[PDB]
Each structure stands twice: as C-alpha cells, then as structure tokens.
Amino acid sequence: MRRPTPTVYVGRVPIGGAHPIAVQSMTNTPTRDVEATTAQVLELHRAGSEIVRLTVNDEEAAKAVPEIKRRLLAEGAEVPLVGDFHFNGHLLLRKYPKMAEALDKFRINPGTLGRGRHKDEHFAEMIRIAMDLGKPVRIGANWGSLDPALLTELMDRNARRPEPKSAHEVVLEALVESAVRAYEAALEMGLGEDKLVLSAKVSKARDLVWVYRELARRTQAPLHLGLTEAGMGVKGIVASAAALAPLLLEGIGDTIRVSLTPAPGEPRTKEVEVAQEILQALGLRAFAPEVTSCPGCGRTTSTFFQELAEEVSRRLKERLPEWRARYPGVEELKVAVMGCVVNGPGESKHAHIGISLPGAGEEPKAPVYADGKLLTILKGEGIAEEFLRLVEDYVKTRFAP
C-alpha cells in the first residue's frame, strides 16, 4: 500500500515510496556551540537518526555549520544535516555560502518568510540557492506559523460557501494550501521533483490525519510526517504514535520525526527510540529484537514473571551491537515471555522463540518453543539463564550468514 513517490536523496539517504521510511530528529544544543552540537549529532545518529536537523537561526549558527560538518566527516560519520531556517534564511544562505554547501538539505517554512510581497522574494532566493547547489528542500508548513494572508483568503472563500465550514476546518485547509502552493511554486521555478519534500504539521492527531491525506492526494512529493508539539512523557509518546499510525498504515509518509519535549535531564535520543518503535510496531521496519509479554494476572506470580521479562529484554539490548555485526536479519527476532498456560504456549509458538512460565495450578516447569514447536522444558533455578542461552543458540542458527 506504500504511496509511490519520486526519490529525494538527503545526502546518501534516499527518501520516497521505493525506500524504507527514514527516521530523523533535531538537535537542541545551540548550533553556535560546535562541540556540543557535533556531539549531539553523533549521539542521535548512533541512536538511529538517519538524518539530523539543526536550527540555523543567526549568523553565529551559520558560521558554525561548516565546522560541525568537517568534524563529522573526520570521524567517517556520513549523517546528513538539514538546516532549519526561519525569518532570515534567505540572508543567511546568501551571506554564508560555505554553510549552504555544508548542509545536505534546507528546510523552508512558508509561514516564516516575511510579510506580504517580501515572502515571494525570500522564497525564490532560497530556492535559487538550493537549485544552484543541487540541494533538496523541505517545504514544511506548521500551524504554529500559518501564513495569515492565506488564512484570510480561505476564510473569505469559506464565508461564500452555501454551508460554511468551521474556523478550525478552514485553518486546516489553509495549512494544506500553504504547503501545496509553495510546492507548485518551487516546481515552476525549476526545482526538480527529486529535490522536494513536504510537511504540514499540526499538534492534534485527528487533524494531522486529515491534513496528510489531503497532502498525499494533492501532491506527488515524498512526505515528512510528524505530530508537532506532541509534548512530554507518556502523553507525547502516545499522541505521536496515535497520530502517525493511521497514516503509515495507509501507506502515507516517507520520513518521520517525533516531536517530544524532553523532561529535564532526559536524553534527546528518546524521540529517536519512539520513532523507531512506531515503525517497528507497524511492521514497516525492523531495528532490534522485540519481546512480546503478557501483562500478567492473578494466574501468575507477578514479580518472578515481571523480572524475567525485564531481564530478557535487558539481555537482548546488551547482545544487539554484536548480533547486528555477526547475524544478518537478527533485527527481526521476536521473543516471547509469558505468564501461564492460557496464552503462553500459543503466543510463544508465534514468536521465533518463547518461554511459557507455570502459572497457578500448573506443574513447576516452563516449556520453551522455537519456530512453532516445543524445543525443551525448563525447571528449577536459573530458568532465566538457561532461556537466554537457548535464545543465543537460536540466533546463531537462524540468523547465520
């Protein structure tokens, strides 16, 4: 069901309907701080951010970008950099051509170009520079910065309707129109279809689904999908997954970014982890082995079961760097850890390998299944260590080169 699109290369990373959905992220360090920004770019890339965006907000930020890129290259890190421009993007790209050349993509917001007539000039200048340098561009609209003139135009169109739509609905129409008009304008100026990505972000999940369905229908471009301003903690994680899934399941979206607010002291890499989990939950990409486990109920002994599931998950995460190097395809591994006979055997049989613990009323033994059939039955002390040895043995055989 994947929506076909042309391919847009962001550095070495291809984005589009023929390619895996790419995970990206954005730094939160001051871009002018070269050491801090370089470190975080590397951190995010190592966590799985295939593309990294950084704000290029003033002259000091712009002068730093070439040095950041140089440092990344010096350690063989080929992570593409997207420059986020607002208000003065045309001035910065004009004045600092080394920055323009160092970036792998430019982000333009059609709502932060300036006022009235100046918008069109500023937009054209940035597209001109991208064309001269062979750079791709994201035209990214956001409802936090919606073009007010376009909003009035569409409010007037709506008022003329036999049955006018709500103000809220018109805001969404205008956001879509902002992206689509700027898309069409960039194409008319000669920027190639292989150099244009679009986004039109809102902060409410049901609205995001409406917007992206319209974008997908009305344009041919690959789409950068995300729920903007998703927020903190569990709310942010849930809202982001809830917003993206209906679209990704329908085949809409070519790159994603999860816009979480970090808690103080929480790593910026959390958003990368969440993005990966969304794609893997929907079977669109595989990044690491996953554990299926039941919630546990009154049929299990809660703490032993919870401890085993946690220990198995912890070991898989410890083994992954090595496994990824030795065992191609191991990212697809499914392990089950289950609490009793009700669903334990059946769920374990659906995993590559799973263990079903004895619950209430059962004999104190734990069947282990692999590839849908009984492998062995464990008992006594060290169930956990015996199981993890069996998982290691399984991986060696199943995912051998």
Ligand X SMILES: C#CCCOP(=O)(O)OP(=O)(O)O
**Would you give the distance in Å from CA 29 to the centre of its chain?**
19
Does 199 contact ligand X by CB under 6 A?
A: yes
Residue 294, interface with its own copies (CB under 8 A)? yes
With binding defined as CB under 8 A, does residue 109 bind its own copies? yes
Q: Which two tokens stand for residue 32?
A: 């002018």
| Secondary structure letter of residue 262 according to DSSP | P
Q: At what angle do helices 148-159 and 167-188 cross, to 10 degrees?
A: 120
- What secondary structure letter does DSSP report for 193? G
* Alpha helices (runs of H) in 49-96, residue ranges in sequence order: 59-74, 89-95
Region of 7-15, 186-194, 277-285, 318-326 interacting with its own copies (CB under 8 A): 277-285
Q: Which does 253 bind (CB under 5 to 8 A by kind): ligand X, ligand F3S, its own copies, none?
A: none
Distance, in Å, from the CA atom of 398 to the CA atom of 396, rounded to the nearest integer, reads 6
Q: Which of 65, 225, 340, 391 binds ligand F3S (CB under 6 A)?
A: 340
* Backbone Cα Rg of the chain: 25
- Which ranges in 265-356 belong to alpha helices (H)? 270-281, 302-326, 344-350
Residues 216-235 that bind its own copies (CB under 8 A): 228-235
Helix axes 270-281, 34-47, angle to 10 degrees: 20
Considering only CA atoms, which of 226, 241, 228, 230 is closest in space to residue 146? 228
- Only one of the segments 3-11, 150-158, 223-231, 281-289 lies at the binding site for ligand X (rule: CB under 6 A); that segment is 223-231
* Contacts of 67 by beta carbon, 8 Å cutoff, 6+ apart: 34
Indicate the SS3 state at residue 286.
coil
Closest CB to ligand X among residues 197, 395: 197
Q: Is 290 in the site for ligand X (CB under 6 A)?
A: no
Give the DSSP per-residue string, 44-55.
HHHHT-SEEEEE
Residues 343-362 that bind ligand F3S (CB under 6 A): 343-344, 359
Binding its own copies (rule: CB under 8 A), the pick from 163, 303, 364, 380 is: 303
Closer residue to ligand F3S in complex, CB, 52/154: 52
Q: Phi and psi dihedrals of 250, rounded to 5?
A: -80, 0
Binding-site member from 162, 298, 321, 380 for its own copies (CB under 8 A): 298
Interacting residue with ligand F3S among 83, 110, 111, 339 (CB under 6 A) = 339
Q: Is 24 near ligand X (CB under 6 A)?
A: no
Considering CB distances under 5 to 8 angstroms, the limit depending on partner class, which of ligand F3S, ligand X, its own copies, none binds residue 231?
A: its own copies
Is residue 293 close enough to count as binding its own copies by CB under 8 A? yes
Encode burial over 191-210: b for 16+ CB neighbours within 10 A, e otherwise: bebebbbbbbbbbbbebbbb
- Nearest approach, Cβ of 373 to its own copies (angstroms)? 14
Between 38 and 67, how does the x/- string for binding to its own copies read (CB under 8 A)? Answer: ----------------xx-xx--x------
54 makes contact, choosing from its own copies, ligand F3S, ligand X, none, with CB < 5 to 8 Å by partner type, with its own copies
Q: Which residues of 327-349 are buried (b: 16+ CB within 10 A; e: fewer)?
A: beebbbbebbbbbbbeebbebbb
Per CB under 6 A, which region of 109-117, 230-238, 336-344, 387-395 contacts ligand F3S?
A: 336-344
How far apart are CB 59 and its own copies at their closest, in Å? 10
DSSP assignment string, 133-155: HT--EEEEEEGGG--HHHHHHHH
Q: Is 347 annotated as a binding residue?
A: yes
Q: Which residues bind ligand X (CB under 6 A)?
A: 84, 140, 142, 199, 201, 226, 228-229, 257, 259, 294-295, 297, 343
- Known binding residues for [4Fe-4S] cluster: 294, 297, 340, 347
Q: Which residues bind ligand F3S (CB under 6 A)?
A: 294-297, 299-300, 338-340, 342-344, 359
